[PDB]
């Protein structure tokens with residue numbers, strides 16, 4: 309049951325891992341390995357400093373639990389979680405294992421010319437995935453082409469949250485102006501820009517800095533403070549803009565790239581949209597199981613949070629095959 313572990317020096321860090329994980333190679337805390345058992349390419353993350361203090365011990369607990377909970381075909385899943393520790397008394401480090409995908413959306417877009425057929429399929433999957441994360445009270449906030457992975461079968465997974473500027477390009481306006489209580493539809497704005505890049509092959513808002521990213525946005529959607537001082541920009545007609553896009557692609561877009569986060573279509577509404585008629589299937593578009601958050605109101609010592617995390621690691625069961 310317990311694997312043989314081996315040890316290794318990598319970026320001034322000694323990694324200790326089960327012997328199934330071979331060829332460890334860091335990228336930028338995170339190593340790519342080859343899982344000889346499963347013949348699968350994997351990423352292995354070793355956690356930075358769990359149990360650092362009390363607020364981290366607790367954050368490590370909460371987020372491990374959130375991650376264990378993820379089970380959906382369009383969302384990164386946990387293949388494995390382990391520690392070389394042989395007892396709670398010596399438990400310090402925690403390792404996470406997920407599979408490494410092969411391609412992602414940015415390397416794809418920068419190499420091949422997609423048809424509307426390809427686009428409809430990719431976005432459906434992204435939205436189906438987004439429906440699920442949102443339903444689990446999560447707000448991803450860095451949705452970008454490089455963190456949208458696709459494997460051989462063209463199955464796409466959303467990758468990069470509770471885990472780890474090209475991002476500013478896909479960021480919702482309200483996220484750049486330090487709103488404090490922003491909405492889940494910040495993620496739908498991201499989808500809209502990704503979608504626009506799929507339809508055309510080009511970056512919609514390739515802006516350098518904050519205010520300038522924003523000048524570029526105003527130039528598409530027209531002007532809605534330092535804004536009561538910004539130039540008059542009239543609203544562009546999206547059909548005149550996206551020369552080729554299925555007029556259904558354009559209507560969905562018109563509803564994603566809206567400034568008022570209150571009027572922006574949700575993940576669930578967008579799935580029901582006529583652009584997705586061939587894939588839309590309401591009885592296989594599931595939401596997250598309720599999770600218990602009793603611990604959320606507990607006030608324990610660091611070795612209690614560590615005790616609990618330990619027990620989560622130990623109890624983890626991997627995906628069947």
Ligand SMILES: CCCCCCCCO[C@@H]1O[C@H](CO)[C@@H](O)[C@H](O)[C@H]1O
Pocket residue numbers: 481482485487489490491522532535567568569570
């Ligand atoms: C220069 C334009 C910047 C963006 C304009 C408004 C962005 C989103 O809109 C606003 O965002 C808030 C948080 O999500 C909400 O509380 C507001 O009700 C909503 O209208």
